[PDB]
Symmetry: D2
Subunit: 409 residues, 4 copies
């Protein structure tokens, strides 16, 4: 009779340590990692909730949340309770004992709002999805939990929490990374991979997590304790990402990215420099909100036979001054200073980085605020680079300031 997103509350689990992103997540959680030239990773789930019409949002934080909390304070500050909206930042006596405990310790935050539906969201993935489709299916199916799932070729799901399904898209088994992922009935060769997105009726959810906290035997996680429990003792249904995903007209397939490794993080950002990227960051119909300040425009200067500031096949944010520096196939976040006779290629450059004169960097990820000393060469000597910085097996160097300062060169 009315749209269901009115009665929904998005609960964002943003306690991801990153870990596999190494120094990139040393002083910040993975949802706080920058992506795309402007936003952060957590901005996609939050914008999905906003654009789906969900007016109540909770975000549970955990590992090194100081930068994430400050981002959510400064950027997602426009919710007003008297308009029936709310944005609750819910940081962790001591740590949360998992991710279902992240919902248990904040019952007294949710239950005052009395939402009828809770949309449990992973806050460390890049994707655009209309959660109204997932809410309608949860009501129409009468399930205890609806789980969003990717349709992935049956060889990529080997590194995924895979749900096996029958012909009515009801989940009959969950397997953590099966060696031979079970396929879709009548559509073998594709398996359903878990997105970490679950829809519950709130009364059912409050009861389920409460039983979990009364189980000293439990690890207090949705995927290892809660989700297997309804899969076996109850009713679980799968929601396919392709049904809910919001595709631009310049998007060639449903887009979802885990950016779990340094190589995957690098590839997802550099792919935005392509002629027609997989992710349309120019889409106005399903916009991504984030914290942004009014910045001066980007500037390209110098044009001698010695030095020319210019960008080619590149994405350049505002407040960037490209002073006699050559940029090719590079993505620059806000406020980057590149100085004369320097050159960057295949570089993901996080905000407020300064490139010293005569430096030459190839196939790199430069962390926030790093000052690259004058004349530094990266991407030329693999063994020297693997000694000075963190180098992936395909030649991408993660460069942090603590690596830079520990060089007598």
């Amino acid at each position: 009779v009315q749209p269901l997103a009115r009665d929904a509350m998005a609960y964002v689990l943003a306690g991801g340590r990153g870990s596999r992103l190494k120094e990139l997540t040393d002083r910040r959680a993975k949802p706080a990692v920058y992506f795309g030239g402007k936003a952060r990773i957590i901005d996609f789930a939050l914008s999905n909730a906003l654009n789906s019409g969900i007016r109540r949002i909770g975000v549970a934080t955990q590992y090194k949340a100081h930068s994430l909390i400050r981002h959510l304070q400064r950027g997602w500050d426009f919710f007003r309770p008297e308009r029936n909206e709310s944005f609750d930042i819910l940081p962790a006596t001591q740590w949360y004992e998992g991710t279902a405990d992240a919902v248990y310790q904040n019952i007294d935050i949710i239950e005052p709002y009395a939402p009828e539906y809770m949309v449990i969201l992973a806050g460390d993935h890049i994707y655009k999805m209309d959660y109204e489709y997932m809410l309608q299916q949860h009501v129409d199916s009468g399930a205890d939990v609806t789980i969003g799932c990717l349709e992935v070729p049956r060889m990529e799901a080997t590194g995924f929490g895979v749900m096996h399904v029958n012909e009515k898209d009801e989940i009959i088994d969950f397997i953590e990374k099966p060696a031979d992922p079970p396929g879709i009935p009548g559509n073998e060769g594709f398996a359903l991979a878990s997105m970490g997105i679950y829809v519950f009726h709130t009364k059912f959810l409050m009861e389920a997590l409460r039983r979990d906290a009364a189980d000293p035997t439990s690890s207090r996680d949705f995927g290892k304790d809660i989700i297997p429990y309804i899969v076996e003792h109850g009713k679980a249904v799968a929601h396919r990402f392709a049904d809910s995903c919001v595709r631009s007209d310049f998007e060639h397939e449903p887009y979802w990215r885990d950016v779990g490794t340094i190589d995957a993080y690098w590839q997802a950002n550099i792919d935005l420099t392509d002629v027609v990227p997989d992710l349309d960051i120019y889409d106005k119909s399903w916009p991504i909100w984030t914290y942004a300040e009014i910045t001066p425009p980007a500037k390209f200067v110098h044009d001698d036979e010695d030095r020319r500031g210019s960008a080619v096949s590149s994405v350049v944010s505002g407040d960037c001054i490209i002073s006699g520096a050559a940029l090719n196939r590079s993505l620059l976040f806000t406020g980057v200073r590149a100085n004369s006779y320097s050159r960057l290629e295949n570089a993901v450059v996080l905000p407020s980085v300064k490139i010293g004169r005569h430096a030459q960097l190839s196939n790199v990820v430069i962390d926030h605020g790093v000052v690259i000393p004058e004349g530094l060469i990266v991407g030329e000597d693999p063994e020297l680079d693997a000694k000075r910085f963190r180098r992936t097996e395909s030649g991408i160097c993660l460069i942090t300031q603590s690596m830079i300062d520990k060089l007598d060169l």
Copy 2:
């Protein structure tokens, strides 16, 4: 002890047609004209008021002000009355419009009175400059003047096109002259003259009766520069305040910066000079920021790198949400949202927001109005007689391009 701006209300006069900007001000008052890549002209005076600590701002607008008013509604929306801040947009009505710039104040006494400020800072809303108004506020009460007037220190040859302040040894105004052929020089500093910036400071009580006396005078032109100021220069006490004293000069600004941008060449030159390696105006300054209306936009993007086409910008300023797809930019300033397409070329171009450049177009020495769609293959800057017959072209060689003109050509 206490700062004077706490008890001051900046009153910005924003009803300037800027007639000599021609089609650039067709449907837009001069304070609403875009400048510098992101801001509009009126944002400088308002940002000077804010950064000087003046928490009450009134903006008087006149002709074709819908786009200016919407800018003020959207960009300057953060003032809170219960924190003793206010931002009043005061368009003419609430019999015709404002009879003059002094009537612009007079019609709005009942807006000014409830605030009861002790000082009134009358600002021109159509100039580009940075200034700390507390210095001027400080000189006013220490001088006992009836009005303090902000003045540029310009060489006498260039002061001939200004309203010039004749000043004695105490910088007291003994005569005001409209565009003198031989401008009176500063005593002891001949060769320089004092040119009015249109910045005034009054005690609010003094100002209210002046404009009320001006309103009860049928002879009056109802204008500050013609009726109120020349009245004080001879019957009251008028003192000049020197812009060099109060100008907020960035460390990378070689001189006090003030631009009128009163003609198309002057508007073009002021914008295009921000592409210098060291510009006169520092748009990367944080100590005295210029606030404006801005939205979150995607970054600028450059695509294609062939021998046929290469998207790139050299010696240029490029705002966000600009897609430079196989287009070659040189010495150009692009506002937000520009789409430049394959095989096109821009040189010495000021390109206002949301302009599309079609493939194979080549434009040199241009000002392209907001939202203009340049047809594919158009050439500007190559045939002066053809460009002048097609567009508004200055005698210096700069074309102003509007969509009306583009729609008016088979050729």
Copy 3:
């Protein structure tokens, strides 16, 4: 599945004079008249749009617009275009030569948004409605216009532009203020009363308006020209208020008021003093947004035999100081200051009113900011009362500052 509000624009008509409110609207448009103790009239239509899910709103203004426009600038300032929200104030040859011209002159504001549906609203009524219902009837009905109608007893409708329908609620004729109004077939005694709420497909509305500006015989009005044009040539289906009205559990009937006359304005505000008011201003599930400031609480002072500052069976806003004044069956907006030995009864007191000592006013509407001189008496001399101020037949006095200024006797 998708809510239709996501793709609609609410276009509020707020250029009304409210002439039978007399000096209450001498310097304000009727949509800017205060109502309820904190809000103004137009806030209800705007809140209905916001709560229905509509985030693109345009408000056309005309007569006495400054305080209305200043109200919209500072109260409805939280919309952000890059979140696909918009709020346009449209005071945009002289004025609006009608009401259909109010849209025609602002097509250049509308069709760039390219909304799929237009919801044309009257901005001078007090009501709570979910516009998703009428949108969800419009696109299923396939009509060229859905018109919101109140089902009123047939002798109330004599002041309405009345339409009658068949068994399928299809509008066959439109009669403006019928002396003997046509009743609904089958169940007569009641009639459909048009509320001035129109729903269109945007592409249809644009043509209907441009063909209405083509005809020179046109008064350029919806209800007078375009609306009767479609029921004669196109398809119109009425929509019943009771199906869409948002009623609290404490509102015993669908609430809608016109407050067209001073007596009707007084009545609607004073009825809020009831124990069980017809309008529940405490319904948080459909809240009315307005311009509001942080204000001090209400203060009640003095308690002697001669003076006692207190309010009984009244509604008192913040920043109100009831100092030795006795209030009874009154409603006070923010900022009122009633001083010692004064007495108010059956009074609607607009913001910032000052009641001097010993003043005793009864059955009045006091205009915004009026200073009541000490010892003034109203309500005891019906003959003297009509001579100083404006008295209705029922004996309600509207008091403005100008009436007080001219008071010798």
Copy 4:
């Protein structure tokens, strides 16, 4: 130089808000003292924040600690209007920057040097965030640079009998501090005017340069309790120059406030008194002074509604202060102060009651000389203020007969 621009442009206010409100007992059990409500809408911390705002300080940092959940949430929702590109900043700084908490009140600044120094403020204004007072810090800033002092301290001029509970500053003819004693049993006196002493408000103005010096060389010394008044301040009064700034010179008074207002509300009786005092005809604190307004977090709420007038119930407030969204239904209120959302029902009576937000007073309940905690649902027929011995056993009753009532005591309730 200048001598024209205000010093506040180059200052940053650092609000210490990590206190426990020790003697407020159950009122600060799940709130820090800066988060305790005061006045009818605002919380205690809003006064120091508003003083900084209205003084011209656009850079604020708030250090939190003990049970900071609702305090931090209050700061996120209310104090959210600062924009860094306008040279404004509001930093919420919880104690997670190391080992457990902040070692002290000076540790709260040293742990956050990395946030302070990029701003590069010229002057540091250290504020206690648990006092009710209105003050223009610009007077203190300008005094600091004309004095050449190392630290300037805000001081209350109180009779020496009352200065026995404060940190007392011993000054000379030039109000230059000679000594500091922690709560002297017989405090020293001011030259030219003894019978009075200078008591520390906990307000310190530093040159940021030297403060960073004093804080870094205070972390690397295990002799220090890592506090300003206990460790930093006494160091300067000995090795440098410490000057006393008197609240009477910078206090912002209304036309309706007859004396420099400063309250500590450190106990339940003091807290109850400070709120009830607002119901007086001429209050000591003028909450209607719009020249120095107190900003806080507030929502659009419905008005206050009074209803019923029979022979035995009449909803009415007398000599009281009633906030919005209050429905006084057949309830009589006298000498009370009600925050937001309070629901008082028929035949109930309140006298001398400070009623925090969203309290519900049940029918026939009669309460006298009480402080009711936020959200407490008073059961029907409850009688408080009638039986001193039984009220003392059921609730937190003060030595002067004020009962603090929390929900943790309404549930635990018997004969």
